[PDB]
Amino acid sequence: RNAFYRKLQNFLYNVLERPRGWAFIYHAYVFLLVFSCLVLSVFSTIKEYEKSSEGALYILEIVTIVVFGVEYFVRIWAAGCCCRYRGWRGRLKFARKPFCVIDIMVLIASIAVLAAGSQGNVFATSALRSLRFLQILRMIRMDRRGGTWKLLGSVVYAHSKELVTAWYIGFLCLILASFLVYLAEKGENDHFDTYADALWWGLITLTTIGYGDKYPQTWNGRLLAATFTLIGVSFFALPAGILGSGFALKVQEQHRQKHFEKRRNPAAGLIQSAWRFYATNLSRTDLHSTWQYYERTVGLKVSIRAVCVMRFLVSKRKFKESLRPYDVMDVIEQYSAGHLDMLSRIKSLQSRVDQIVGR
Amino acid sequence: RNAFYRKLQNFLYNVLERPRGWAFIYHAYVFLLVFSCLVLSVFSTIKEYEKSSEGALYILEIVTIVVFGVEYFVRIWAAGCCCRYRGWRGRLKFARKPFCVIDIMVLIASIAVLAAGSQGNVFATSALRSLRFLQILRMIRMDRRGGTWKLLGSVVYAHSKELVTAWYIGFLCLILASFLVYLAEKGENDHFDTYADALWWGLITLTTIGYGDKYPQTWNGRLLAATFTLIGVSFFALPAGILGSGFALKVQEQHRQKHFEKRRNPAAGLIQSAWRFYATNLSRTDLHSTWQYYERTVGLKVSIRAVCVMRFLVSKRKFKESLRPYDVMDVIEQYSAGHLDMLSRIKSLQSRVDQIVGR
Amino acid sequence: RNAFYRKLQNFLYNVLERPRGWAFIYHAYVFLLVFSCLVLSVFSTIKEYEKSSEGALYILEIVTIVVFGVEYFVRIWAAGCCCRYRGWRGRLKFARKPFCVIDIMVLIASIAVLAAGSQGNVFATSALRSLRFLQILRMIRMDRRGGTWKLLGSVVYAHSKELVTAWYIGFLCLILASFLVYLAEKGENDHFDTYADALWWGLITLTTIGYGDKYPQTWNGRLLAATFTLIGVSFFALPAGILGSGFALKVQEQHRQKHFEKRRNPAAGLIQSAWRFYATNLSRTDLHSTWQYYERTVGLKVSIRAVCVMRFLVSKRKFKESLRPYDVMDVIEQYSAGHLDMLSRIKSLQSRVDQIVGR
Amino acid sequence: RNAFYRKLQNFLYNVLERPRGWAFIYHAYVFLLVFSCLVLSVFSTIKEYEKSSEGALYILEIVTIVVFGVEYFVRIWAAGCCCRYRGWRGRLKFARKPFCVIDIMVLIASIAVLAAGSQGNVFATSALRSLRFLQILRMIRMDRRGGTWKLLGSVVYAHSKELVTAWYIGFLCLILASFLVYLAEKGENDHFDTYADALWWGLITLTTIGYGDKYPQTWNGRLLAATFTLIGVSFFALPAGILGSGFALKVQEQHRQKHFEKRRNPAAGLIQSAWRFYATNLSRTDLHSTWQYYERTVGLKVSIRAVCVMRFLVSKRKFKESLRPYDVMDVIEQYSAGHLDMLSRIKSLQSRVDQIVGR
Amino acid sequence: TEEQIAEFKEAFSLFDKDGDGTITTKELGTVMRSLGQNPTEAELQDMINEVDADGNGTIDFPEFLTMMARKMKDTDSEEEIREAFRVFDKDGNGYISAAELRHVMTNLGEKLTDEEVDEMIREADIDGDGQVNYEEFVQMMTA
Amino acid sequence: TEEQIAEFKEAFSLFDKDGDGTITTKELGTVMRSLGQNPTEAELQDMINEVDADGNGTIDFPEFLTMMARKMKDTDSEEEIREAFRVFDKDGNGYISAAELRHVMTNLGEKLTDEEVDEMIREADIDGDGQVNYEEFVQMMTA
Amino acid sequence: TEEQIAEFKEAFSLFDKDGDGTITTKELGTVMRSLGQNPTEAELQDMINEVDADGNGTIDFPEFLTMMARKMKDTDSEEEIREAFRVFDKDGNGYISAAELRHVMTNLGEKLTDEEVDEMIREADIDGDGQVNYEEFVQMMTA
Amino acid sequence: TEEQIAEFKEAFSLFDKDGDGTITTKELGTVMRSLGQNPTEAELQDMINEVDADGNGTIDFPEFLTMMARKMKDTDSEEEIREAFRVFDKDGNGYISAAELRHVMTNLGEKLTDEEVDEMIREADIDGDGQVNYEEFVQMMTA
Numbered sequence A, B, C, D: 001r002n003a004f005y006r007k008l009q010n011f012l013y014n015v016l017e018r019p020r021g022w023a024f025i026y027h028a029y030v031f032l033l034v035f036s037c038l039v040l041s042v043f044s045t046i047k048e049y050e051k052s053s054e055g056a057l058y059i060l061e062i063v064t065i066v067v068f069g070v071e072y073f074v075r076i077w078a079a080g081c082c083c084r085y086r087g088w089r090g091r092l093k094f095a096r097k098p099f100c101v102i103d104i105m106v107l108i109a110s111i112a113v114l115a116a117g118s119q120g121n122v123f124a125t126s127a128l129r130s131l132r133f134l135q136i137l138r139m140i141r142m143d144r145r146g147g148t149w150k151l152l153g154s155v156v157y158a159h160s161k162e163l164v165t166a167w168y169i170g171f172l173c174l175i176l177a178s179f180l181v182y183l184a185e186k187g188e189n190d191h192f193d194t195y196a197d198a199l200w201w202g203l204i205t206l207t208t209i210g211y212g213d214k215y216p217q218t219w220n221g222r223l224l225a226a227t228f229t230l231i232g233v234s235f236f237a238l239p240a241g242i243l244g245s246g247f248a249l250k251v252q253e254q255h256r257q258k259h260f261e262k263r264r265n266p267a268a269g270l271i272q273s274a275w276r277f278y279a280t281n282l283s284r285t286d287l288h289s290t291w292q293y294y295e296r297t298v299g300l301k302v303s304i305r306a307v308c309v310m311r312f313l314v315s316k317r318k319f320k321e322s323l324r325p326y327d328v329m330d331v332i333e334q335y336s337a338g339h340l341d342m343l344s345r346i347k348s349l350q351s352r353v354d355q356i357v358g359r
Numbered sequence E, F, G, H: 001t002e003e004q005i006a007e008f009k010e011a012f013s014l015f016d017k018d019g020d021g022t023i024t025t026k027e028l029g030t031v032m033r034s035l036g037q038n039p040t041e042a043e044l045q046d047m048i049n050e051v052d053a054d055g056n057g058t059i060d061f062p063e064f065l066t067m068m069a070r071k072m073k074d075t076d077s078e079e080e081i082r083e084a085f086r087v088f089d090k091d092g093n094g095y096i097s098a099a100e101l102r103h104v105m106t107n108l109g110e111k112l113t114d115e116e117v118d119e120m121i122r123e124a125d126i127d128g129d130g131q132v133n134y135e136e137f138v139q140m141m142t143a
């Protein structure tokens, strides 16, 4: 009973919290489901299609709210598989997580909208904006880890100075070109009736949009727009290329490092050292295993404690160093160490067959 | 007779299936031919030019269908050069390939369109859409390997998480900005008469299109569009840069690895081991060559079989490892092995001239 | 008194000149402040909002001018922390810096605009353009180092040939396509009434703008525009991708090199050598420390001077070489040196146990 | 006289043919001059400015034709500095170069246009197109090496498969999306009156242009355009990013390799060997230098010839290998060679102090 | 209490064989090398600096006491343990079979006898299944 | 049948010189080293783990039998053979000259006598041309 | 003046033990090796070329005089000193504690006695605080 | 003519000390090693394959004759010479000073005496300036 119970618990936790293979399918389905809902809500906002789409929208709304509630309950139950959250207080702490609170606020907001806004199925006008915002936040919540946001932030920080330079130059050219076009076509063109119209046009231009609502018509304004467009469209599109290139480089490095064996071995060393530490506790009247083992390898008790903790902390440090493997630093450090070892060898042979030459 | 016959067979198979140099020219010509056909069909759809282009279109259609049929026959004949497909059943298996079936469906569809739709060369209105779709599928088939699709899929999978992040952020900003612009200009602007018009405008904007059919006109809507355009045009253009950079990195690595000599030698080892395996079969009352060779190098027969299979399987593994050469992993593994060898050396010298010092 | 005085001096200099952490916040605030000013000035240029925004604009103008003046005074005071600028002449030299003069010209121009252009807070029409240009130059000055400009220039120079190729091809296709479209639609389309309209349209096109004011309408002009758009939009967008990729590669290399320990040690060697140089000056009737130290390590005085300067200059060179660490050159040089050392070792052992074999 | 004559010859050849520093300035000036000419010709095509710009255009035309002629003469004179082109036949061969013939055709075409088209200064209507084409070809000729074209071709070939994939996918989606939009909005929208209008709109869309002349208006056509725009704008912009990234990678590798010392030394070896080859010619009754040198290092004459040619050809091969330095291949080859040397060392020590152990 | 300080003083005296008052690299190598564990001098000397608060190249009594008070709860070893059992979890289930513990303990790091891994399985295998969870064991650390 | 199992038992006994019942790395090195083939101990020991199903560092009788039943048809060696003859095909025609086989056999891998390559050309050169196709030979493997 | 030239001639004679008139790599190694400083011959020989104006592999009297006149003010050593104290400034404040000077002097580069760092702190620690500024010391160079 | 073939036969006999008819790596090493030039066997053996048309590991008389007929004009050595003098042209003027030739000849590659570089300057320095052009010398090769 308990074996299958815990098997199901861990399987559900893996599917919901850390999906790798088939679990994603389910997630995708939910996303599609949620996606469909907005689409139906989308199709319900139009009057000519509201009468034809509102029933399906309401049915899908009941389905999605039920699915979200059951998923939340299953997740807060499967949180018992990991020992961080077990028991009443453990499940409470799991619920304390920001995305869990986001989920419950989503559920209660959906309930409130369905109760008040839907005197029937179709929804109230005021509740419509709240419903759309709720769907937006559900889409935000679709990913629980926020790994996308973390990755984007890390990549941006890696290029913080440099994105900053791109943005600063882009803004400067936008302001300056807008100012001159406003000067040149203040009265001749009604499009640039005001400086603000010039700023809007310059933003539309430097972004490669080209709405056509505003555009220079004079020779001088057109010339200046041409020059500063050539100058600044590249700057405005630069952050996209910056990020794309940097993203590809990051994934390339991650692929390069993947091997991770020199990370494996120090893990074994460190875990053995940690078990020695726990087994050599002086205050514990147990753990005779490591005690007698050391007694084979030999004030005394405290000295053994001290040496064991020295080696455990240094092994922790060593595992920390192996925590980040880089091919370049790997080769550099390995070659430095090997060169030092080789130096020791040659000093040995020199002094040593010097002793021989003496004889 | 047979020598020249097989020479022609292999030459045709190389030209059609695996073109490297001049063969591509022919392929290009066919592509151009096929391309011209749609263009002529294109030029035939316009009434003012249909009377002037339909005769050439029909002639090129006969030419291209004949060329495709003869090419299919020549290919299914030249499939005999490779031993996978030889004889009646071999050619049947070759025809089983998905692109071969695509070719025959193309041929039969072309025949059907030319027979029914062309009561007089010029084609029937209903058969016109089928003809255009047939041309589209022919263009799809132009490449038999599908190497382009495989490369695109591999690169996408390499950046799957990361393209996913880009798409997710782009979609989120699109939805959110469209929602606010719809709020700001629901009644003031007829362009954003509905939320759906706002979504269409937001997609046209974030993609740098700027049709001009819809655009904000209010100060608040224009401000929000400006901000979220700055935010999200980079995200929308990101996948292009992601893919381009990743593509360049992949080709760069492929160029880096090209040497392949440590891949060459294990191939020789493995093939020699495989021939030993076949030559040492116990059930075979032949192959006295390797039998007597081993008899020079020496229950007995089975032991020889066992050792030979050990070495053959390990050589297969070794060739497998050399199957993928990476400069970084090459240097890491080679330096680790050399360092271990060096350690063995120095232990030898230490213990050994210690023996000497003893004397 | 002096301790806290100098502590505050260095803290202010760090915050203003070289901000790393919290100091940036203050800078950002000032930027935002300055930014707000233009926005308010922006909002003040519109007549319908001028009466509502001019008072806040004037108040923020007084605030920003006061802030800039006090910041300039605090900076020219905190310049005493560094020994380059101390005392009357030191502060004068600090003021000689181009960005310091930019700051004072900004302050005086702001004073002049506020005195003359503002008869009563409201600003004069002629002084308005000067005020906007002053804000533009303040935004330019926001960064004192100009590190963004230096980085952009360095990256451009790194790709100078290659950006040049991109620009040259883009310009050529623009000219040529514009010429043909002008030929094809000289009279048929009023949009391309002149070659210059064709050039403007071609620039709008190759930049992916698509205003819609001008566009081909004839079959031939549309075909040519299609072909050369496909050809040249990639060329026009190329510089953006070039720069983005190159920027990412540069930051990647900078991250790769970061370790800098082989740069640390030669610094110690060089500084010790420099102190030896100063301590071994012959004309100085002091510095008996290094004099007696060398007297322990031993015409004589001049010889010691000479040897000390030899070693100091060579250590300076060595530190110079370690000034630029590159992983690739690090590995190449280190392996060459280690291989030469190994060669020396093996020659020693060969000749040496040859001597042994002789016995 | 001859010393200064040749000094000027080489200086002019360097400035014109291979400009590095200040020479570029002159080139730039000429380019600007030529550029100005078209601009003036540009400004001369407009009737309202033709009367004001034609005199300056004609003056600049005389100036530029004179400058081009004198530059051609100076270049064909300075071609004597290099020994490839010296004397009557040498200068003729130099003139045979394709860009030299381009220059003379440019000069003669300019003369013809100025003589016939310009009854005075004003230019003939028919000669105007020829003049503009001549300016276009002059701009083409501005660079004599064609290094930009060679670089672009090399980079394209490096990514030939991959650019091909991008283009193929882009074309496929363009065709397919255009076809469906034409189906959906054949009659509803006059913009897509024909399939060809749909193709033009699809090209304008996938390129991020957005002219606004044509665009979907129906729900289904708009949906399909949205989907395939998302799909294919990235593909259409892909070649730009591909090329930019690849360009940056190429320049990065070129910067990486720059050191070139292992290329320097084999050059010395090879040139010494080549001089030995020339000095050891048997048929030459001279060159007693290397003959007696070898006589110190020793049928005989032919044997010396043979050995010298062996070493010269192998040194040529060695210099060829050092012709292309790659950091990755450098490290791989150097480590393989060092490992083999180390193996030889350890075999020596093993067998050798085994001999010692025997004693 | 003074008892722990006295025990640390006794430990230092058993370490300060030379009586220098600051156990030096060679001396701390000697003290444990005689017992039967003979780590290479490199590990000892490069470890000393990691704990040498004053950076004297040795360990003085204050540096002895500060770490003697420092237990598993400090040094945020929790993350290191998380990574350590996550690397050896080829499935990611958060649990590892006991036999894999036997193997990894035996053939990696500082090898220990079957007795050490026996007490390990005693402590970790609380529910007696073999597939011991990582989170519970790491919680036992602080507990 | 029991005949093959008896032959495998005889082979194991001829291998288990110590009689341990699990041929160990050193023992399997000794058994073939005495015959006349003396591979470095590294290759043997690193090969043992590749076939050691239980991971004991040796080969037990079940691990002997499982592979003894495992023939060329298993282990999807077909792809390895395809790559192996594709690398040595400088033309890509799918066929390789016999003389190149002589050379590559002689000067690479475990070198064999002209007799081995003679039987090789006998089997592969079915049509007697020298330019033997790869596909036919690899089909002969499974056949 | 002629006094400095005479002193340089005396120095060269004390260097040109062989009397060749161009102090050679081995000879300049010998001259200072006998004193008590014994740098490896590699450093000496690779340094000679850096100052060898004529590139003869040795140092002639003109190359001696040119540098003897060349003081700290030349060779733009200012930037090198700036980098040298900027690397060891973990804070970037532009000043470094005296104790860090003691440590870096003792444990890096050509090590010197406490007397050398004592005169160093004498000169640099003008205001007697320990946190000596880099800019003032580097100004002292040219001064 | 038959004279050159006879001379090549005499050369081969002076090379084929063993009389094998195909000068082998060790034999061609011995023949020139005795004269006074003693290149490492590695260079000889790795060079043999570069000229071994039949790939026998040696040089047969046909491979001797084919190259004996092959002069400087073949093997497109022109490009190699262009690169070789372009690398040593730090200015790119297309000419190199004679003293730099002295230095590079002396201190790189197979070093030769001042006599060799003397005949070099004789041939190259046709106009007697020292700054000898590369193009003229490389033309002299084919001439």
Ligand SMILES: Nc1c(NC(=O)CCC2CCCC2)ccc(NCc2ccc(C(F)(F)F)cc2)c1F
Binding pocket: B156, B166, B167, B168, B170, B171, B174, B235, B236, B237, B239, D230, D231, D232, D234, D235
């Ligand atoms: N595919 C795509 C691309 N283009 C590519 O990724 C090219 C490569 C893909 C992979 C294989 C086929 C095409 C660029 C941007 C976005 N924006 C995100 C997005 C916005 C709106 C919606 C919605 F409105 F339709 F929901 C969905 C998603 C995007 F999706």
